[PDB]
Write an enzyme that holds these catalytic residues in place. Structure first.
Site, PDB file in Angstrom:
ATOM      1  N   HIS A  25       0.504 -33.060  38.284  1.00 52.43           N
ATOM      2  CA  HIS A  25       0.726 -33.383  36.878  1.00 52.43           C
ATOM      3  C   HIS A  25      -0.054 -34.639  36.510  1.00 52.43           C
ATOM      4  CE1 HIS A  25       4.519 -30.942  35.970  1.00 52.43           C
ATOM      5  NE2 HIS A  25       4.338 -30.777  37.266  1.00 52.43           N
TER       6      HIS A  25
ATOM      7  N   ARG B 244       2.491 -28.740  25.525  1.00 48.82           N
ATOM      8  CA  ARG B 244       2.976 -28.987  26.899  1.00 48.82           C
ATOM      9  C   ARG B 244       3.592 -27.711  27.493  1.00 48.82           C
ATOM     10  NH1 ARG B 244       5.889 -32.719  30.233  1.00 48.82           N
ATOM     11  NH2 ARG B 244       7.996 -32.032  30.841  1.00 48.82           N
TER      12      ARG B 244
ATOM     13  N   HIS C   4       1.667 -27.998  32.902  1.00 50.55           N
ATOM     14  CA  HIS C   4       1.806 -28.506  31.547  1.00 50.55           C
ATOM     15  C   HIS C   4       0.452 -28.519  30.906  1.00 50.55           C
ATOM     16  CE1 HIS C   4       5.788 -30.616  32.789  1.00 50.55           C
ATOM     17  NE2 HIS C   4       6.085 -29.580  32.013  1.00 50.55           N
TER      18      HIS C   4
ATOM     19  N   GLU D 255      -2.161 -31.492  30.301  1.00 45.88           N
ATOM     20  CA  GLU D 255      -2.491 -32.346  31.444  1.00 45.88           C
ATOM     21  C   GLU D 255      -3.786 -31.933  32.137  1.00 45.88           C
ATOM     22  OE1 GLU D 255       1.119 -32.578  33.791  1.00 45.88           O
ATOM     23  OE2 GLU D 255       2.369 -33.146  32.096  1.00 45.88           O
TER      24      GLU D 255
ATOM     25  N   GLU E 146       1.501 -37.510  39.882  1.00 42.50           N
ATOM     26  CA  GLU E 146       1.217 -37.849  38.496  1.00 42.50           C
ATOM     27  C   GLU E 146      -0.103 -38.613  38.506  1.00 42.50           C
ATOM     28  OE1 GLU E 146       3.080 -36.882  36.001  1.00 42.50           O
ATOM     29  OE2 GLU E 146       4.788 -36.113  37.184  1.00 42.50           O
TER      30      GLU E 146
HETATM   31  C1  LIG Z   1       3.405 -38.342  31.315  1.00 41.60           C
HETATM   32  C2  LIG Z   1       4.020 -37.561  32.474  1.00 41.60           C
HETATM   33  C3  LIG Z   1       5.147 -38.371  33.119  1.00 41.60           C
HETATM   34  C4  LIG Z   1       4.573 -36.205  32.011  1.00 41.60           C
HETATM   35  N1  LIG Z   1       5.745 -36.380  31.180  1.00 41.60           N
HETATM   36  C5  LIG Z   1       5.717 -36.040  29.880  1.00 41.60           C
HETATM   37  O1  LIG Z   1       4.712 -35.613  29.297  1.00 41.60           O
HETATM   38  C6  LIG Z   1       7.023 -36.179  29.117  1.00 41.60           C
HETATM   39  C7  LIG Z   1       6.754 -37.024  27.884  1.00 41.60           C
HETATM   40  C8  LIG Z   1       6.170 -38.380  28.230  1.00 41.60           C
HETATM   41  C9  LIG Z   1       6.865 -39.232  29.087  1.00 41.60           C
HETATM   42  C10 LIG Z   1       6.347 -40.472  29.422  1.00 41.60           C
HETATM   43  C11 LIG Z   1       5.142 -40.866  28.866  1.00 41.60           C
HETATM   44  C12 LIG Z   1       4.447 -40.023  27.996  1.00 41.60           C
HETATM   45  C13 LIG Z   1       4.962 -38.778  27.667  1.00 41.60           C
HETATM   46  P1  LIG Z   1       4.950 -35.108  33.431  1.00 41.60           P
HETATM   47  O2  LIG Z   1       3.740 -35.175  34.321  1.00 41.60           O
HETATM   48  O3  LIG Z   1       5.306 -33.727  32.941  1.00 41.60           O
HETATM   49  C14 LIG Z   1       6.381 -35.760  34.328  1.00 41.60           C
HETATM   50  C15 LIG Z   1       7.169 -34.646  35.001  1.00 41.60           C
HETATM   51  C16 LIG Z   1       8.211 -35.350  35.885  1.00 41.60           C
HETATM   52  C17 LIG Z   1       9.374 -34.440  36.255  1.00 41.60           C
HETATM   53  C18 LIG Z   1      10.303 -35.124  37.256  1.00 41.60           C
HETATM   54  C19 LIG Z   1       9.571 -35.383  38.574  1.00 41.60           C
HETATM   55  C20 LIG Z   1       9.318 -34.098  39.354  1.00 41.60           C
HETATM   56  N2  LIG Z   1      10.496 -33.244  39.356  1.00 41.60           N
HETATM   57  C21 LIG Z   1       7.896 -33.770  34.003  1.00 41.60           C
HETATM   58  O4  LIG Z   1       8.407 -34.289  32.989  1.00 41.60           O
HETATM   59  O5  LIG Z   1       8.008 -32.541  34.243  1.00 41.60           O
HETATM   60 ZN   LIG Z   2       3.688 -32.582  33.575  1.00 42.71          ZN
END
Ligand SMILES: CC(C)[C@H](NC(=O)CCc1ccccc1)P(=O)(O)C[C@@H](CCCCCN)C(=O)O
Ligand SMILES: [Zn+2]
Ligand SMILES: [Zn+2]
Length: 304
Positions: A192, A122, A64, A67, A266
């Protein structure tokens, strides 16, 4: 000018893959596993001393684009491997006995775009039929309950699942690499940020992996290990109940291929800075994450 304590643009990281490979030919080799939507080489580093029939751990960063601490971490891991090989017993054993495939940046096109146009991008940068909206969520693009929960069907959405599983050149390239090397890859790690968590399957439905108890214990001990350094607090457990349901994830896909140790990390922080984690946190974040990753690596090594 590349630095492990700053965020490096794609040109810098690409030159770094070549240079780090040249400077450490006994420990590193470099290949390209595919090209992106825009045609950039997806580089992969194989870190380890050559030997027969070695098991492997696969780790990718930069799914992403926004990140940035993820990309920095894969570089840090390589930094550590080359710096400490020979001096620190554990890392030396790891590199002697296993190979690490480190993919420093999967979504290169998105990463370039966060540097040139939109820091908070993203998705990939591919086009979609019937709209001008750009990109697919690569972590909704794997063939694992594809497009069923926690993924959007709208190409204009940030969790858009794509036109089909593996529709993206980048996720096709990663899945192909893993399929072609399944008999040696024993663990899959995907990095991530943010929110400080160690997750394992499943995210595509509320179901638990056959080796739930083992992965739960491992994740618990790895978070305990991470906290030793600066006290940073992580949570852990199955994706769906620990962060949210999210079908089409690479960790769930990898796990369903038979790779028994599959985790998504994360990193920092818990939202104060979020994606814009300052460069002054790079060092501490990577160092404490190294402790978790080495813990998982040591467990894998000891439970072959
Ligand atoms: C902030 C993190 C949790 C990211 N999520 C996002 O950017 C989605 C939008 C968001 C959600 C929560 C807080 C801030 C933003 P992420 O690192 O991209 C989380 C991962 C989690 C996927 C499910 C677990 C593994 N299969 C994702 O959404 O792909
Ligand atoms: Zn991510
Ligand atoms: Zn260190």
């Amino acid at each position: 000018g590349h630095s492990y304590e700053k965020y490096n643009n794609w040109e810098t990281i690409e030159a770094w893959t070549k240079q780090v490979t040249s400077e450490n030919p006994d420990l590193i080799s470099r290949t390209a596993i595919g090209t992106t939507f825009l045609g950039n080489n997806i580089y992969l580093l194989k870190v380890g001393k050559p030997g027969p029939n070695k098991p492997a751990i696969f780790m990718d960063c930069g799914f992403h684009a926004r990140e940035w601490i993820s990309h920095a971490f894969c570089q840090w891991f390589v930094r550590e491997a080359v710096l400490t090989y020979g001096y620190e017993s554990h890392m030396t054993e790891f590199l002697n006995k296993l190979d690490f495939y480190v993919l420093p940046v999967l979504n290169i096109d998105g990463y370039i775009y966060t540097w040139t146009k939109n820091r908070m991008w993203r998705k990939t940068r591919s086009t979609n039929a019937g709209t001008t909206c750009i990109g697919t969520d690569p972590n909704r693009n794997f063939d694992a309950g594809w497009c069923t929960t926690g993924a959007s069907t709208d190409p204009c959405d940030e969790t858009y699942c794509g036109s089909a599983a593996e529709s993206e050149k980048e996720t096709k390239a990663l899945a192909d690499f893993i399929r072609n090397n399944l008999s040696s890859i024993k663990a899959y790690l995907t990095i991530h940020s943010y929110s400080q968590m160690i997750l394992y399957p499943y995210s595509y439905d509320y179901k638990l992996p056959e080796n739930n108890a083992e992965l739960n214990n491992l994740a618990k001990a790895a978070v305990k290990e991470l906290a030793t350094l600066y006290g940073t607090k992580y949570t852990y457990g199955p994706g769906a109940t620990t962060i949210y349901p999210a079908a089409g994830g690479s960790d769930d896909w990898a796990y369903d291929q038979g790779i028994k140790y599959s985790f998504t990390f994360e990193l920092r922080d818990k939202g104060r800075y979020g994606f814009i984690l300052p460069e002054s946190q790079i060092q501490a974040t990577c160092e404490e994450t190294m402790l978790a990753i080495k813990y998982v690596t040591n467990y894998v090594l000891g439970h072959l």
